[PDB]
Short mmCIF file of C-alpha atoms and ligand atoms in Angstrom, two decimals:
data_model
loop_
_atom_site.label_atom_id
_atom_site.label_comp_id
_atom_site.label_asym_id
_atom_site.label_seq_id
_atom_site.Cartn_x
_atom_site.Cartn_y
_atom_site.Cartn_z
CA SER A 885 11.48 -31.95 15.84
CA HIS A 886 8.18 -33.12 14.30
CA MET A 887 8.43 -31.87 10.73
CA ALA A 888 5.05 -33.17 9.58
CA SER A 889 3.24 -30.69 11.88
CA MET A 890 5.56 -27.72 11.42
CA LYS A 891 3.58 -24.69 10.36
CA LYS A 892 4.23 -22.25 7.52
CA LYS A 893 4.00 -18.48 7.90
CA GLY A 894 1.43 -16.87 5.72
CA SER A 895 2.00 -14.37 2.99
CA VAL A 896 1.97 -10.62 3.23
CA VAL A 897 -1.46 -9.43 1.99
CA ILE A 898 -2.45 -6.13 0.41
CA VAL A 899 -5.44 -4.86 2.43
CA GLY A 900 -5.83 -1.33 1.11
CA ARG A 901 -4.01 1.66 -0.32
CA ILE A 902 -3.20 5.29 0.21
CA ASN A 903 -5.02 7.03 -2.64
CA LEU A 904 -2.93 9.86 -4.06
CA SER A 905 -4.46 10.11 -7.53
CA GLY A 906 -6.53 13.26 -7.04
CA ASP A 907 -6.55 16.42 -4.92
CA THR A 908 -7.11 14.69 -1.55
CA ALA A 909 -5.01 11.93 0.02
CA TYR A 910 -7.08 9.24 1.70
CA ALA A 911 -6.80 5.65 2.86
CA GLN A 912 -8.98 2.97 1.27
CA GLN A 913 -9.50 -0.53 2.63
CA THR A 914 -9.86 -3.21 -0.01
CA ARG A 915 -9.96 -6.33 2.21
CA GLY A 916 -11.18 -7.02 5.74
CA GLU A 917 -9.45 -8.91 8.56
CA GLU A 918 -11.14 -12.27 7.97
CA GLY A 919 -10.46 -12.20 4.23
CA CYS A 920 -6.90 -11.04 4.91
CA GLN A 921 -6.32 -14.06 7.17
CA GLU A 922 -7.58 -16.49 4.49
CA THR A 923 -5.56 -14.85 1.71
CA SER A 924 -2.44 -14.98 3.85
CA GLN A 925 -2.82 -18.74 4.28
CA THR A 926 -3.47 -19.46 0.61
CA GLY A 927 -1.25 -16.79 -0.93
CA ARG A 928 -3.91 -16.28 -3.59
CA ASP A 929 -5.16 -12.73 -3.85
CA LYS A 930 -7.47 -12.00 -6.76
CA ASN A 931 -8.27 -8.43 -5.73
CA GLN A 932 -7.55 -5.59 -8.12
CA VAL A 933 -4.51 -3.58 -7.05
CA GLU A 934 -4.24 0.11 -7.84
CA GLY A 935 -1.85 2.89 -7.01
CA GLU A 936 1.66 3.39 -5.63
CA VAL A 937 1.28 2.98 -1.88
CA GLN A 938 -0.29 -0.19 -0.48
CA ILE A 939 -1.44 -1.00 3.02
CA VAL A 940 -0.20 -4.51 3.81
CA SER A 941 -0.71 -6.96 6.64
CA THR A 942 0.48 -10.24 8.06
CA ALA A 943 -1.23 -12.19 10.81
CA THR A 944 0.40 -9.99 13.44
CA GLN A 945 1.40 -6.67 11.88
CA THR A 946 0.18 -4.01 9.43
CA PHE A 947 2.39 -1.49 7.63
CA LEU A 948 2.88 0.02 4.15
CA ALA A 949 4.58 -0.91 0.92
CA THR A 950 5.59 1.41 -1.93
CA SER A 951 6.12 0.68 -5.64
CA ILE A 952 9.25 2.25 -7.16
CA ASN A 953 10.72 1.17 -10.53
CA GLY A 954 8.41 -1.83 -10.80
CA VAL A 955 9.23 -3.26 -7.35
CA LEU A 956 6.91 -3.18 -4.33
CA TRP A 957 9.25 -2.32 -1.44
CA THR A 958 8.74 -2.56 2.29
CA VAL A 959 10.61 -3.16 5.54
CA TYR A 960 12.13 -6.43 6.70
CA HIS A 961 10.89 -5.80 10.27
CA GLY A 962 7.35 -5.97 8.89
CA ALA A 963 7.60 -8.65 6.21
CA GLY A 964 10.58 -10.78 7.21
CA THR A 965 11.24 -13.23 4.40
CA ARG A 966 7.53 -13.72 3.62
CA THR A 967 6.00 -14.17 0.22
CA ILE A 968 3.31 -11.76 -0.97
CA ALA A 969 -0.13 -12.98 -1.99
CA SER A 970 -0.87 -12.69 -5.66
CA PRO A 971 -3.53 -13.81 -8.15
CA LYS A 972 -1.63 -16.98 -9.05
CA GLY A 973 -0.29 -17.85 -5.61
CA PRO A 974 2.51 -16.68 -3.37
CA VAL A 975 5.38 -14.69 -4.87
CA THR A 976 8.91 -14.89 -3.42
CA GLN A 977 10.86 -11.76 -2.56
CA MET A 978 13.21 -10.69 -5.31
CA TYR A 979 15.17 -8.50 -2.88
CA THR A 980 15.96 -9.09 0.79
CA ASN A 981 18.43 -6.95 2.76
CA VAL A 982 18.18 -7.32 6.53
CA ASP A 983 21.13 -4.93 6.93
CA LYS A 984 19.02 -2.15 5.40
CA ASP A 985 15.69 -3.40 6.79
CA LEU A 986 14.55 -3.70 3.16
CA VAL A 987 12.63 -6.23 1.06
CA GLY A 988 10.95 -6.15 -2.31
CA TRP A 989 8.73 -8.14 -4.61
CA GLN A 990 7.83 -7.68 -8.25
CA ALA A 991 5.19 -4.98 -8.34
CA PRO A 992 1.61 -6.29 -8.60
CA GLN A 993 -0.23 -6.02 -11.87
CA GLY A 994 -2.33 -2.88 -11.70
CA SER A 995 -0.09 -1.00 -9.34
CA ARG A 996 1.67 2.17 -10.49
CA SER A 997 5.29 2.95 -9.63
CA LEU A 998 6.91 6.09 -8.29
CA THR A 999 9.95 7.43 -10.11
CA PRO A 1000 13.23 7.69 -8.18
CA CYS A 1001 14.03 11.32 -7.39
CA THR A 1002 16.94 13.04 -9.13
CA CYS A 1003 16.08 16.60 -7.98
CA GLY A 1004 18.70 16.82 -5.23
CA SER A 1005 16.02 18.70 -3.18
CA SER A 1006 15.69 18.55 0.62
CA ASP A 1007 12.05 19.59 1.04
CA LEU A 1008 10.30 16.24 1.45
CA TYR A 1009 6.88 14.85 2.30
CA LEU A 1010 6.12 11.69 4.28
CA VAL A 1011 2.88 9.83 3.60
CA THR A 1012 1.41 7.86 6.49
CA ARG A 1013 -0.97 4.89 6.62
CA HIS A 1014 -3.72 7.35 7.56
CA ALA A 1015 -2.96 9.43 4.44
CA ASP A 1016 -1.50 12.27 6.45
CA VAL A 1017 1.14 14.15 4.47
CA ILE A 1018 3.95 15.23 6.79
CA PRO A 1019 6.49 17.87 5.68
CA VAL A 1020 10.03 16.66 6.36
CA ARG A 1021 13.26 18.58 5.86
CA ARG A 1022 16.07 16.28 4.72
CA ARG A 1023 18.96 16.41 7.23
CA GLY A 1024 21.32 13.75 5.86
CA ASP A 1025 21.51 10.74 3.55
CA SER A 1026 18.93 8.83 5.58
CA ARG A 1027 17.44 11.29 8.10
CA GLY A 1028 14.82 14.04 7.98
CA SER A 1029 13.21 16.29 10.58
CA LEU A 1030 9.48 16.73 10.96
CA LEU A 1031 8.56 20.36 10.63
CA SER A 1032 5.82 19.66 13.19
CA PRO A 1033 6.79 16.86 15.60
CA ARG A 1034 4.24 14.12 16.29
CA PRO A 1035 3.84 11.38 18.91
CA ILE A 1036 5.18 8.08 17.65
CA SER A 1037 1.56 6.77 17.75
CA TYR A 1038 0.89 8.94 14.69
CA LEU A 1039 3.65 7.26 12.71
CA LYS A 1040 3.19 3.70 13.91
CA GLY A 1041 2.22 1.40 11.05
CA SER A 1042 3.71 3.65 8.35
CA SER A 1043 7.05 1.90 7.85
CA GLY A 1044 7.36 1.06 4.19
CA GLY A 1045 5.67 4.30 3.16
CA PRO A 1046 7.27 6.93 0.94
CA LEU A 1047 9.10 10.15 1.39
CA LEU A 1048 8.48 12.20 -1.75
CA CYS A 1049 10.01 15.34 -3.25
CA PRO A 1050 7.92 18.37 -4.27
CA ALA A 1051 7.51 16.87 -7.75
CA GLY A 1052 6.24 13.58 -6.37
CA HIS A 1053 9.31 11.47 -6.95
CA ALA A 1054 10.31 8.80 -4.43
CA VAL A 1055 13.19 9.91 -2.17
CA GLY A 1056 13.09 7.13 0.40
CA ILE A 1057 11.16 4.44 2.28
CA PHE A 1058 10.20 5.19 5.92
CA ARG A 1059 12.15 2.84 8.24
CA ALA A 1060 12.24 4.09 11.85
CA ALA A 1061 11.28 7.07 13.99
CA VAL A 1062 13.79 9.19 15.86
CA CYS A 1063 12.03 9.57 19.13
CA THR A 1064 12.54 11.19 22.53
CA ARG A 1065 9.92 11.03 25.28
CA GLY A 1066 7.63 9.45 22.68
CA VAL A 1067 7.66 12.45 20.30
CA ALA A 1068 9.00 11.84 16.81
CA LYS A 1069 11.14 14.85 15.89
CA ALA A 1070 12.85 13.08 12.97
CA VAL A 1071 12.62 10.01 10.78
CA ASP A 1072 15.10 7.46 9.48
CA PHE A 1073 14.52 6.29 5.91
CA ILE A 1074 16.06 4.00 3.30
CA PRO A 1075 17.22 6.36 0.55
CA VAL A 1076 16.07 5.56 -2.96
CA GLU A 1077 19.72 5.30 -4.04
CA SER A 1078 20.09 2.35 -1.71
CA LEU A 1079 17.10 0.72 -3.37
CA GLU A 1080 18.76 1.44 -6.72
CA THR A 1081 22.01 -0.18 -5.56
CA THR A 1082 20.17 -3.13 -3.99
CA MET A 1083 18.55 -3.54 -7.42
C1 LIG B 1098 6.87 4.65 14.81
C2 LIG B 1098 6.88 4.24 13.53
C3 LIG B 1098 8.21 3.68 12.95
C4 LIG B 1098 8.35 3.56 11.45
C5 LIG B 1098 8.18 2.30 12.28
N1 LIG B 1098 9.42 1.59 12.46
C6 LIG B 1098 9.85 0.93 13.68
O1 LIG B 1098 9.09 0.81 14.59
C7 LIG B 1098 11.24 0.43 13.67
C8 LIG B 1098 11.49 -1.09 13.76
C9 LIG B 1098 12.60 -1.17 14.49
O2 LIG B 1098 13.80 -0.61 13.86
C10 LIG B 1098 14.48 -1.52 13.09
N2 LIG B 1098 14.13 -2.89 13.17
C11 LIG B 1098 14.85 -3.78 12.30
C12 LIG B 1098 14.48 -5.24 12.38
C13 LIG B 1098 15.25 -6.14 11.43
O3 LIG B 1098 15.07 -7.48 11.42
C14 LIG B 1098 14.05 -7.97 12.27
C15 LIG B 1098 16.34 -5.65 10.51
C16 LIG B 1098 16.68 -4.21 10.45
C17 LIG B 1098 15.90 -3.27 11.37
N3 LIG B 1098 16.24 -1.88 11.31
C18 LIG B 1098 15.55 -1.00 12.16
C19 LIG B 1098 15.86 0.48 12.12
C20 LIG B 1098 12.43 -0.08 15.66
N4 LIG B 1098 11.84 0.92 14.99
C21 LIG B 1098 11.72 2.32 15.38
O4 LIG B 1098 11.19 3.12 14.66
C22 LIG B 1098 12.33 2.72 16.72
N5 LIG B 1098 13.21 3.81 16.51
C23 LIG B 1098 14.57 3.51 16.23
O5 LIG B 1098 15.02 2.41 16.27
O6 LIG B 1098 15.33 4.61 15.92
C24 LIG B 1098 16.63 4.43 15.81
C25 LIG B 1098 17.29 5.88 15.74
C26 LIG B 1098 17.00 6.20 14.44
C27 LIG B 1098 17.34 4.84 13.60
C28 LIG B 1098 16.92 3.81 14.42
C29 LIG B 1098 11.19 3.06 17.69
C30 LIG B 1098 11.87 3.18 19.07
C31 LIG B 1098 10.10 1.97 17.81
C32 LIG B 1098 10.46 4.36 17.32
C33 LIG B 1098 6.88 1.62 12.06
O7 LIG B 1098 5.90 2.18 11.73
N6 LIG B 1098 6.97 0.20 12.21
S1 LIG B 1098 5.54 -0.56 12.00
O8 LIG B 1098 4.87 -0.41 10.71
O9 LIG B 1098 4.65 -0.12 13.08
C34 LIG B 1098 5.82 -2.29 12.36
C35 LIG B 1098 6.51 -2.60 13.68
C36 LIG B 1098 6.14 -3.13 11.15
C37 LIG B 1098 4.76 -3.22 11.77
ZN1 LIG B 1099 12.36 14.78 -7.29
#
């Protein structure tokens, strides 16, 4: 009831990336925890952004975000309604869909965007926050099975990351793990068509 002391949530902050530009996939950190905390409060991030897949953080969570068609997409359960930090101050979401667990902001200058897949192919690849590439067979509009199941620990923090086709197009955004006895045998993802409709 005391508005003058009500706090504001900070921005989502880009803290690294999954580098996919060469022959080896690897995670890079571009900002530490202390600098992330300060950037989240100000919303002013002057760091150079590169690549398609970003590692992002709030004060309490860390996850991924993926650029497709000029929009940096991630999950609502990670970002909520938060702004993203940017060189000129906080930037408001341009898409928010809690029913799909989806949000998006204009893609940062310097990022590169994935192209939405039109191959109609079901041999996919999930990219995790540790730069593991996980073969996934598509099993429906929004589901795929891991060829080699993994404990959910291995997937935790990778929501917002991409599923790609063999040609490297974006097929979907990783949303939730399909888990029994803590082993992920399948994944739930936001299909790129749903992004394209949301757009
Ligand atoms: C392990 C890595 C996972 C990718 C990951 N995802 C999650 O943990 C998501 C968030 C939440 O699901 C949702 N929450 C929502 C919340 C909303 O408004 C608040 C609105 C819409 C939402 N829609 C969904 C689906 C639960 N869940 C799951 O996966 C759960 N399995 C599940 O529910 O399966 C069913 C059957 C198959 C379909 C759904 C599980 C039990 C924890 C494994 C991950 O990495 N997250 S994350 O980065 O660590 C981190 C928490 C961000 C930091
Ligand atoms: Zn494709």
